[PDB]
Design a protein around this ligand. Sequence first.
Ligand code: CLA
Ligand code: CLA
Ligand code: CLA
Ligand code: CLA
Ligand code: CLA
Ligand SMILES: C=Cc1c(C)c2cc3nc(c4c5[nH]c(cc6nc(cc1[nH]2)C(C)=C6CC)c(C)c5C(=O)[C@@H]4C(=O)OC)[C@@H](CCC(=O)OC/C=C(\C)CCC[C@H](C)CCC[C@H](C)CCCC(C)C)[C@@H]3C
Ligand SMILES: CCCCCCCCCCCCCCCC(=O)OC[C@H](COP(=O)(O)OC[C@@H](O)CO)OC(=O)CCCCCCCCCCCCCCC
Ligand SMILES: CC1=C(/C=C/C(C)=C/C=C/C(C)=C/C=C/C=C(C)/C=C/C=C(C)/C=C/C2=C(C)CCCC2(C)C)C(C)(C)CCC1
Ligand SMILES: CC1=C(/C=C/C(C)=C/C=C/C(C)=C/C=C/C=C(C)/C=C/C=C(C)/C=C/C2=C(C)CCCC2(C)C)C(C)(C)CCC1
Ligand SMILES: [Fe+2]
Lengths: 341, 33, 32, 112, 505, 38, 56, 30, 34, 34, 81, 37, 65
Amino acid sequence: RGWFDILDDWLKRDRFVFVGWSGILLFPCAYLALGGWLTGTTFVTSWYTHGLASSYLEGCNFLTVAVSTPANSMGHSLLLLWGPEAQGDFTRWCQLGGLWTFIALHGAFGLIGFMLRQFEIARLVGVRPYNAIAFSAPIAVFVSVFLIYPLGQSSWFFAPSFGVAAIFRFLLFFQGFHNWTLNPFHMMGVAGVLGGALLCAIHGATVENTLFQDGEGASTFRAFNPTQAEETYSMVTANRFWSQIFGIAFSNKRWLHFFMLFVPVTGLWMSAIGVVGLALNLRSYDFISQEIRAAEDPEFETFYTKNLLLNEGIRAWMAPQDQPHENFVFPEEVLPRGNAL
Amino acid sequence: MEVNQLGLIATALFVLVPSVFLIILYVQTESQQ
Amino acid sequence: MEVNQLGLIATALFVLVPSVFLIILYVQTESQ
Amino acid sequence: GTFNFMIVFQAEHNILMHPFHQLGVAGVFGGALFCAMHGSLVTSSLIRETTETESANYGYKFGQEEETYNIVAAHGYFGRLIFQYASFNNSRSLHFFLAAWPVVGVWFTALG
Amino acid sequence: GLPWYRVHTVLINDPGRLIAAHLMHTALVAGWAGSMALYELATFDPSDPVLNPMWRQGMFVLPFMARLGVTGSWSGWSITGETGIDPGFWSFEGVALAHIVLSGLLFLAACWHWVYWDLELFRDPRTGEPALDLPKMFGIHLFLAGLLCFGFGAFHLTGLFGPGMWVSDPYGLTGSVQPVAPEWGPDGFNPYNPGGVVAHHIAAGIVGIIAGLFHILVRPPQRLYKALRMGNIETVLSSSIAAVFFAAFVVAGTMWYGSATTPIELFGPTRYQWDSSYFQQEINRRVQASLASGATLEEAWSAIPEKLAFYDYIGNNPAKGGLFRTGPMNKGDGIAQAWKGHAVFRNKEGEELFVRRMPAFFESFPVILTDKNGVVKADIPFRRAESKYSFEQQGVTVSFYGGELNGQTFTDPPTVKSYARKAIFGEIFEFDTETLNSDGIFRTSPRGWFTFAHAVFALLFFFGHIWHGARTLFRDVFSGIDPELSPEQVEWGFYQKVGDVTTRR
Amino acid sequence: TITPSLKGFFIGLLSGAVVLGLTFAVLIAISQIDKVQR
Amino acid sequence: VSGSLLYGNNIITGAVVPSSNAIGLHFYPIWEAASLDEWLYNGGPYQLIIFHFLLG
Amino acid sequence: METITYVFIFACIIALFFFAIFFREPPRIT
Amino acid sequence: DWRVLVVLLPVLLAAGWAVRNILPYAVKQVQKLL
Amino acid sequence: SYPIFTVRWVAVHTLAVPTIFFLGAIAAMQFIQR
Amino acid sequence: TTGERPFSDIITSVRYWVIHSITIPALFIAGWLFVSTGLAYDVFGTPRPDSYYAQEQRSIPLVTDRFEAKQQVETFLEQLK
Amino acid sequence: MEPNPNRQPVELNRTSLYLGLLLILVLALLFSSYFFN
Amino acid sequence: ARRTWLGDILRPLNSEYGKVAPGWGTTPLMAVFMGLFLVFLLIILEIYNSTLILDGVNVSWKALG
Ligand code: CLA
Ligand code: CLA
Ligand code: CLA
Ligand code: CLA
Ligand code: CLA
Ligand SMILES: C=Cc1c(C)c2cc3nc(c4c5[nH]c(cc6nc(cc1[nH]2)C(C)=C6CC)c(C)c5C(=O)[C@@H]4C(=O)OC)[C@@H](CCC(=O)OC/C=C(\C)CCC[C@H](C)CCC[C@H](C)CCCC(C)C)[C@@H]3C
Ligand SMILES: CCCCCCCCCCCCCCCC(=O)OC[C@H](COP(=O)(O)OC[C@@H](O)CO)OC(=O)CCCCCCCCCCCCCCC
Ligand SMILES: CC1=C(/C=C/C(C)=C/C=C/C(C)=C/C=C/C=C(C)/C=C/C=C(C)/C=C/C2=C(C)CCCC2(C)C)C(C)(C)CCC1
Ligand SMILES: CC1=C(/C=C/C(C)=C/C=C/C(C)=C/C=C/C=C(C)/C=C/C=C(C)/C=C/C2=C(C)CCCC2(C)C)C(C)(C)CCC1
Ligand SMILES: [Fe+2]
């Protein structure tokens, strides 16, 4: 019964918000990532890193406000407050993009803290730790996208900035420069997310329409008791229904709920891998066979060659404002354009 | 189309090797029960 | 050497298919 | 061709900046999240019916009348992961929430 | 029946067959190494380390042999281009042979240990159950690890008893295997200092010996044994995976940014060398200094070694590849033959013009010409009808200094434009595209392929860590929660401390 | 010798120490005052 | 625009292409075409497919 | 050859569908 | 500068006001910690 | 006999307090003109 | 169920609203002042509508050096003095 | 010397086989275009 | 089980399964090495990152001559 054990006691008390040992990492870091994002979006500009306004103070609304990435010139600098870039000056630190590293790193340690909490609470309660395991998928996306991707690039400048329209911009960048929609790892992600949403909706709907009549009321919610031993819907009728509508159905509730874990988690992991490739401009940009034929045969046209024309438009039209440090000057006559437009 | 020749053997094997593996485990499961 | 590159897939399936057949029969024998 | 359609749609309609598309993403991302959540929570709270050498799935038999996981145990873990009252203890309300969130998000993105 | 995803769990309580599986894994890995080297040897062109170095030929294990001092072939060539050497037995071939003989001896060991699994050594003398004393194993293996880490650095890297390692000048021109002296001061933590690699293995080696010794004599505290399930071989798997992905991240990173152990003559340049125009500045330095020392234009550029000029070319940028663009870089832009010369563009007014270089992000990039001050004075227009900067209007010409086109000037717009189109890639080379039937699309280098693979495996191994760590700490409920978990344990307030049933109220 | 960034390092290092230590000084105390009965 | 496998597409790039802008919203059944060759050039299959699919 | 490969794989999936539906392990109650 | 105390004054009065209305009840909780 | 200051108290005010301050600043912002 | 005071019971209590009918507007006013005084601009370095560009300037004042970047935006700010 | 007591039978039910084949066939269908390139 | 010459030799090396030092043992000392090793990785990392800048430590290729 020493101090360590006394603190364990106190951390693990059953209270409205459980603390745990993981709370020591989670809570400060989660609160600081979120404070940094609300602080930056309210007050802080992107003028010096990006030539953009990005805060409510400047006239931005909820969609356009962002905590923007540091200037490309900062490389992959940690941009510590006390570091040689900002030399302790909090004002300069904001103006140089320090809040982006602040948010990203405190955010990274918070996700760790959060998944530690999932492990901690599951051990204390005596459940298997599959919810923690599932949470590995959001971690993978976060690190690959916000950390790995810009680390393979020239700077943090090219990571996503923390904001609604700034993320939209990130999406469009990845189409035009990486042709990310063509990437089978994104496609596997798409099918995991869409497959997830489908499973979510189809499983909720099935339970609600194979219910057992357990209460007298038109409102079927009242007739469930959290401690009842009985399944509250018929798996048998659900199974016959889906077998006759769709041909196959689930017959094993355990497989079903595992598959629900499996689909979206795997989807996310696959997309993380592909972003890791893009860290290196290692893209699924082209099909070589298509380019060779099309170079030689100017009547050959597919949706594949149509979409690269659009990526070419995107790059040339957005690059100068989206990468100001490159001092891209594209005179009117070099801009790719179709007829009339 | 000027397509990578090894795509064919790669697709074939990518398909055949894992499938044969599955079949092997299935048929020997059925012969138990 | 300017060989027939269809020969590689031909050789490969020549071996894999019938060999797979035998392996499947043998394993299902060992489990009954 | 799909990608072509969605790139042109964005040029001509700025769909990313359209609230109904944003609700679609909310409905699709949330759908995937809650699929994972519900799957991981039911999976987390399976009742030991098997040994370490067999699939846990064999602990459920088709049409058995008892439930095959402990929802109070799942509630107790998830309520403590967040706080008690952000966690469901009624399986009907939970599965209706599961159904409604993606359905409505996608209604909206279809309406977008 | 075991499900397919669990078949190998039959080793968990069977140390001999575990060893036999590890032996078999080691066999397959050493056999791969031998087979890969032999394939590379069968496909490598040693005849031009200037313009057809190994990293252009998609060589992957070759450079790791070269890094540690294997540089010659029994055939008389060496990767540094000298001819008529006798490398002794430790040629590329001898090394590939060694690993194959190794693979074979490992294979037999595995058979023996699989059959003779029931060795008394593995049984706990008290209880007669199989049992591994993992804390002591750790100390033994750490001690070995330290010995070898120490000797690697003490003897091999020094050249004390051994060859050293690949070192080179900052511009990867004059590399060779050299013995390296330890750097013991603060610059040995500089990743670009090879002497730090020596110091590291000497110091870390000794620390390994000491810790090994600690870990053989000193039993783990009871608190820690219980906390980390030190009775459970899977806790070692979880921490071992963790360590492995730590290290895989480190090695992807130093491969991508570059360090003393990933030199550009064996792996190719980094993308940052293009980003910062690293080679271009050195090149311009040399010409400026050639001209200050009263050399003609022709003379100063002809003095640029081709090797240096080839680095200043975006086709060797590892960030210009594609995921399904397979094979060696030569399969894309072809096999570099000659440096054509440095291209100078001038408008009709004798102004010198500068082609804006393609950045690594861009699959395609427009041709824009500028003056020393950054101002646009010529381009290739997309829309012709309102174009004001066309090469035709501006009278752009290209003159070549050095290389094969030295002293030549082209004025016909189509040619001028054509060299302008290559000048965005940097320095302009002649390529053989026929030999490999090159398709003209940039591929990444071994630097790229290595970083991609190791960053992906690392990320994947993080999930391994999480999986087997969860299984170690929740072994008791792997198969399900206790079927008599009552609500008091799980409902709120019942216990002051969560799950601690001794704190009711 | 002793450079600005090296002073900055020690500033960071000491700040972290303070913040961790203070945080743990607080947690030791509260856990000592408000124990579980058992 | 070529959409089918035998005309130089793969699984990723192929498509049944939408019908001609020249048709607009006009109904274009097979029997409104002079011939299948016309119907295929102008993208008749798309309409046939989407109308049957949406009904079905 | 690529055409053949694509259509072959597709055909296998359709056949798999056939077996998965009409030749499933039939579900048996309790 | 002076703007800071402008900003900070309501939050001092806020805390001061809450300080007053809760002080009595807040001491009974501390006595109860043994 | 409830406690007034709890861990809970603190998490609530850790968020609620700067939320309001922030809402006041963003309110003042709607009257800024160029 | 854990021993803290129910939320529903607090926000209907008279004592609660006696404190918070002060503490909420004080915080709302504090925040107002943070902005209305101009302090928020100076703390964070956020440009005022008149100080994005110098009068005849349309160059963004974009940071271009890593370790001189502090001196760079300091220079741009004086190009408004 | 005794025969090894750690051996175990492996199972793959028919549903798992249908699922695994579908996974592989669909994976092949997705990547095949990239392999041919 | 099968006894062998090499097994008898190695025997005492695999003979203390489950043996532990009481209580916390050396754990406080471990934590000193862990804490030191962290600071050491921080320094190594920030040197590579160039937020730590030291005299005579040119973190560039140009530190090969
Ligand atoms: C507890 C969780 C936590 C965690 C994990 C982090 C983690 C981080 N923070 Mg954050 N921070 C926290 C809480 C936390 N913070 C709190 C509570 C505050 C409020 C003050 C802040 C405020 C804050 C700011 C303002 C900044 C960070 C930054 C950082 C980063 C750099 C930290 C660093 O280099 O440490 C270095 C120090 C250590 C690692 C401490 C090590 C402990 C040593 C080994 C012990 C030394 C003891 C000594 C020898 C004994 C006495 C000596 C003698 C003098 C007597 C990192 C991502 C920076 C950042 O994000 O930049 C982008 C940054 O600018 N933090
Ligand atoms: C049918 C359309 C579709 C669908 C379904 C998807 C689906 C996906 N896309 Mg793709 N995308 C599409 C179209 C689509 N895409 C198109 C047309 C393009 C143009 C090229 C892109 C471009 C694109 C990019 C550029 C990227 C994706 C990514 C992704 C993945 C996002 C994963 C995720 O949940 O991130 C959500 C983020 C996380 C899970 C990380 C952790 C988040 C933590 C948990 C949040 C904590 C919040 C905190 C508590 C505070 C909240 C409160 C605060 C707001 C106040 C997913 C696989 C991403 C990806 O693959 O990366 C792996 C990515 O980078 N997409
Ligand atoms: C990884 C562990 C480790 C180990 C085993 C060593 C080992 C060594 N260091 Mg390194 N060192 C390390 C980490 C390590 N260092 C780190 C992380 C840094 C910061 C980047 C340094 C910075 C450093 C400096 C600046 C110097 C050394 C020196 C030395 C040597 C002993 C010097 C002596 O007798 O003074 C006592 C040393 C010790 C008791 C052991 C290490 C204590 C710290 C790390 C260094 C002490 C600085 C020293 C007093 C400076 C004297 C010179 C002065 C004129 C500046 C020895 C080879 C010195 C040397 O060889 O001269 C070039 C030296 O000047 N080291
Ligand atoms: C770390 C491993 C590694 C690395 C980095 C390299 C790197 C390289 N090799 Mg080597 N090689 C390796 C392992 C490796 N090799 C092994 C193990 C073998 C034996 C198979 C070989 C055999 C080999 C040969 C025979 C050749 C090379 C060549 C090359 C070069 C070209 C690489 C290329 O085009 O990739 C192409 C890479 C891809 C197309 C990416 C593959 C990614 C796959 C498709 C992902 C699979 C997805 C999966 C199914 C996802 C679903 C899972 C989900 C459902 C859960 C390059 C230097 C070539 C060269 O130039 O040598 C002179 C060459 O001819 N390599
Ligand atoms: C040193 C590395 C290492 C080791 C020794 C193990 C060992 C084990 N794992 Mg773990 N694991 C690891 C890494 C490792 N794992 C990593 C990195 C991951 C994340 C991908 C996992 C994820 C994981 C899961 C999710 C599970 C295991 C399980 C197991 C156990 C049964 C596995 C089995 O029978 O395979 C059976 C596998 C096959 C029959 C075929 C595998 C075919 C794969 C998909 C592709 C083939 C790749 C190729 C052969 C070569 C490898 C390439 C490269 C990595 C070298 C066994 C104790 C299982 C377990 O816990 O049982 C209780 C389990 O459920 N592992
Ligand atoms: C954009 C999509 C998206 C969001 C917003 C999101 C959000 C969340 N998912 C959580 C959980 C999960 N997510 C899961 C699966 C998934 N989650 C997905 C997608 C998302 N998940 C998908 C697609 C899946 C399917 C696999 C699982 C399985 C879980 C959980 O178990 C967990 C939970 O409890 O869910 C109910 C919660 C983690 C809370 C937390 O860490 O607190 C701590 C907060 C921290 C550490 C701060 C992190 C800081 C972040 C990373 C950076 C800063 C972000 C800014 C402040 C805001 C930026 C906003 C602009 C970008 C617009 C949180 C509500
Ligand atoms: C979206 C899903 C929500 C569905 C709604 C239904 C949920 C069902 C709840 C359980 C069964 C029904 C109980 C009915 C009751 C009901 O549904 O809720 C009412 C409940 C108020 O509870 P009181 O204890 O005030 O009263 C008991 C009530 O049950 C009244 O009946 O709401 C809250 O808990 C308010 C506190 C949130 C404020 C917390 C802010 C600070 C949090 C900081 C911590 C951050 C997160 C943690 C870090 C990770
Ligand atoms: C960064 C930093 C820091 C920190 C910070 C913090 C921590 C902050 C916080 C902050 C906060 C914490 C904030 C908050 C705010 C919030 C807000 C601003 C909100 C808003 C809201 C709204 C507006 C909403 C509304 C609505 C709607 C719209 C609809 C639905 C409903 C509702 C009502 C929700 C420090 C100091 C450490 C230092 C360093 C730097
Ligand atoms: C017996 C004997 C012998 C012999 C031996 C031999 C001859 C060996 C060989 C060996 C070898 C010959 C080996 C090999 C190996 C290989 C392997 C092991 C491979 C692997 C691969 C992999 C694993 C891959 C994977 C993949 C793919 C495929 C695709 C891409 C992606 C990845 C990478 C994932 C001697 C005489 C010496 C001695 C005595 C005895
Ligand atoms: Fe369910």
